């Protein structure tokens, strides 16, 4: 009949993330010719989407789970870089050149920033 | 209102090589008068003024 007392930091970190993400989202918008680039991070891997918030739909996608992206050897950062490459290619196939960048409730720098900078290098306008 | 020596005092903000007096009303019980300041003059561009009364 052991019982806990209160908040774990997992809950804290989670709900704080959602808090600041839906803070940030006030200024970011969505559209099929200017969609939103959402990123959703974990310690291990990462996920990203291109979102149209006019209909809450999705146009592209990518993540560091796919074996073809695990075929990278280098750091987490390099996984993220190749992810940015894949999403640039896919976005510019499905017909999107310009986007915004939603950091999804995370700080800019590290894996997020290296992703985004690789994408800016490889053609996306932001 | 009047011209008393009010806490909110002083005026004139003149420009170097830029003659476009920009004005502002400020206090004078605080220390400073030889730093900061900036604005757009005539024919010129974003450059630095004095608070010169």
């Amino acid at each position: 009949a052991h019982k806990p007392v209160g908040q774990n930091i997992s809950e804290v970190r989670r709900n704080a993330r959602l808090r600041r993400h839906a803070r940030l989202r006030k200024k970011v918008a969505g559209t099929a010719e200017v969609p939103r680039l959402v990123v959703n991070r974990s310690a291990r891997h990462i996920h990203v989407q291109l979102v149209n918030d006019l209909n809450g739909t999705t146009l592209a996608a990518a993540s560091s789970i796919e074996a073809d992206v695990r075929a990278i050897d280098g750091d987490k950062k390099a996984h993220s870089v190749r992810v940015g490459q894949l999403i640039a290619e896919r976005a510019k196939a499905a017909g999107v050149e310009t986007v915004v960048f939603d950091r999804g409730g995370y700080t800019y720098g590290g894996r997020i920033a290296a992703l985004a900078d690789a994408a800016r290098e490889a053609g996306l306008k932001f | 209102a009047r011209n008393e020596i009010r806490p909110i005092v002083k005026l004139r903000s003149t420009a170097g090589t830029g003659y476009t007096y920009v004005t502002r009303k400020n206090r004078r019980n605080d220390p400073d008068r030889i730093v900061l300041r900036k604005y757009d003059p005539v024919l010129r561009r974003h450059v630095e003024f004095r608070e010169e009364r």
Partner: protein, 182 residues
């Protein structure tokens, strides 16, 4: 490539003993100290704004980290207290530095208190967080005990992921706090 005394001891014996006492399903339920807390209320902020610096220097010499200066968010004028008057210093301790601090405290100073019969088992709260207090800083050999101009006591409080006072007292016993065994 290093281990403090109390932490090696913690990972060797104490976790085992608490397991054999309370029989948890997951070992994640095991109690573990998180942090250690230090505070000093100057209180004469409106009469000596310099004892604050004195206390800062003492806690610096004591804990090896520059403290935080806690401001007064409310203004209660029956004490002269006004919004922003520094009343006290505060320090947080976490990790190897914490374990070293507990080693020093248990092994140098608390065996230097005058007529130390025992720290109560009743400084806990809700689940086992031990909040005691020191009158003087005339005890840490860390301190230069020649230069002190006044007593500047302090207040310590020790927080743990323990869920009740029984587990708290048992853990702190295994770790070697001189409770009054009763």
């Amino acid at each position: 490539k290093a281990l403090p005394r109390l932490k090696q001891r913690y990972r060797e014996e104490i976790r085992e003993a608490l397991q054999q006492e309370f029989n948890y399903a997951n070992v994640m339920q095991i109690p573990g100290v998180v942090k250690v807390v230090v505070n000093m209320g100057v209180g004469d902020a409106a009469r000596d704004a310099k004892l604050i610096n004195g206390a800062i220097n003492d806690l610096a010499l004591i804990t090896g980290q520059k403290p935080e200066v806690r401001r007064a968010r409310k203004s209660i004028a029956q004490f002269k207290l006004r919004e922003g008057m520094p009343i006290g210093a505060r320090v947080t301790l976490r990790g190897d530095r914490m374990w070293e601090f507990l080693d020093r405290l248990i092994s140098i100073a608390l065996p230097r208190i005058r007529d130390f019969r025992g720290l109560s088992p009743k400084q806990f709260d809700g689940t086992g967080n031990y909040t005691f207090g020191l009158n003087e800083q005339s005890m840490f050999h860390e301190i230069d005990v020649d230069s002190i101009d006044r007593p500047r006591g302090m207040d310590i409080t020790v927080v743990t992921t323990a869920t009740n006072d029984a587990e708290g007292r048992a853990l702190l016993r295994a770790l070697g706090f001189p409770f009054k065994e009763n």
